[PDB]
């Protein structure tokens, strides 16, 4: 019976405007919008940049996500950044894997 209005994965939100029938008598049925949000509490400010500050503030204006300052890594998407590496004095760029679990070659 749930109608999942929004499932934005950056600003994790699961607004479900599920209708609930009231008791045995209809015509007073209640409508409820369950904004289930999972604040990460640990993700960095610029989530793709690990060296950025920590998120001490989480704005969830529901108007924007109904229709970006990304917070939570999406399952399918891979967030990564280049890293410097030194082995014998050579500084070689290479891509990283900030979410290795979902970033296997597929």
């Amino acid at each position: 019976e749930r109608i999942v209005l929004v499932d934005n994965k950056c600003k994790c939100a699961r607004i479900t405007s599920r209708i609930i029938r009231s008791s045995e008598d209809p015509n007073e049925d209640i409508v409820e919008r369950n904004i289930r949000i999972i604040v990460p509490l640990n993700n960095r400010e610029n989530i793709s940049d690990p060296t950025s500050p920590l998120r001490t503030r989480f704005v969830y204006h529901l108007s924007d996500l109904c229709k970006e300052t990304c917070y939570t890594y999406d399952r399918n998407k891979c967030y990564t950044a280049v890293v410097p590496l030194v082995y014998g004095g050579e500084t070689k760029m290479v891509e990283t894997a900030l979410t290795p679990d979902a970033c296997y070659p597929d």
């Binding site: 919008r33 001490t56 890293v83």
Partner: protein, 231 residues
């Protein structure tokens, strides 16, 4: 007069995009009689010693072998033997090195731990340990960074892989970096990288600062606006 064949470290395989074999002999008199040929499993020898570097502070002889071989050829399991004909050695010896057969591939889960609260209370130094757990093959490569600036190789010291007690196939590695507690108290981010085969693109990184390593306080300012937001 000891010569040892060094198996190809994955650091050279990946970052330099080449395979180099070094069967170096040290603590021997200089006669320049070394004839080093990296004979393969087949009769053909891929390459001989190149760029011999005798110059050292101790003035002892030092001949280093080289073998530029294909990475796929390495993965095929072909073995290579280094032979030394120096008169110091009583007889020539061949050092066969082979790529291990049937090694399982498992992701190197990288966990970065912050210095203990008590250690910071010491107000003298703080040690950050990057733990690499559950990886196969045993070979692994770890480096350290701070806000995009790699640290000196001496500042961070890593441990040789040892078997994982619960998973005999897997291994674990241990790398520790030390910094002044003021640097840690500043909140400077420290990032640890692990270069290993099992990873998707062979490199993964994790970072930690004062505010995320078992922090005492969670300062949240959660704000929601336009709760209704019908659409």
């Amino acid at each position: 007069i000891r010569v040892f064949a060094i198996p190809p470290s994955f650091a050279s395989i990946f970052l330099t995009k080449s395979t180099k074999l070094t069967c170096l002999v040290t603590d021997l008199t200089t006669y320049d009689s070394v004839t080093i040929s990296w004979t393969r499993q087949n009769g053909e020898a891929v390459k001989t010693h190149t760029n011999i570097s005798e110059s050292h502070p101790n003035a002892t002889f030092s001949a280093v072998g080289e073998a530029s071989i294909c990475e796929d050829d390495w993965n095929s399991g072909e073995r290579f033997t280094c032979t030394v004909t120096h008169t110091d050695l009583p007889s020539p010896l061949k050092q066969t090195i082979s790529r291990p057969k049937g090694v399982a591939l498992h992701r190197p889960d990288v966990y970065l731990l912050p210095p203990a609260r008590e250690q910071l209370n010491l107000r003298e130094s703080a040690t950050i340990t990057c733990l690499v757990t559950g990886f196969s093959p045993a070979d692994v490569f770890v480096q350290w960074m701070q806000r995009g600036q790699p640290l000196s190789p001496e500042k961070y010291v890593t441990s040789a892989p040892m078997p994982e007690p619960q998973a005999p196939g897997r291994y674990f590695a241990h790398s520790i970096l030390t910094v002044s507690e003021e640097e840690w108290n500043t909140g400077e981010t420290y990032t640890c990288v692990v270069a290993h085969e099992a990873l998707p693109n062979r490199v993964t990184e994790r970072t930690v600062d004062k505010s995320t390593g078992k922090p005492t306080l969670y300062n949240v300012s959660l704000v929601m606006s336009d709760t209704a937001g019908t659409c």
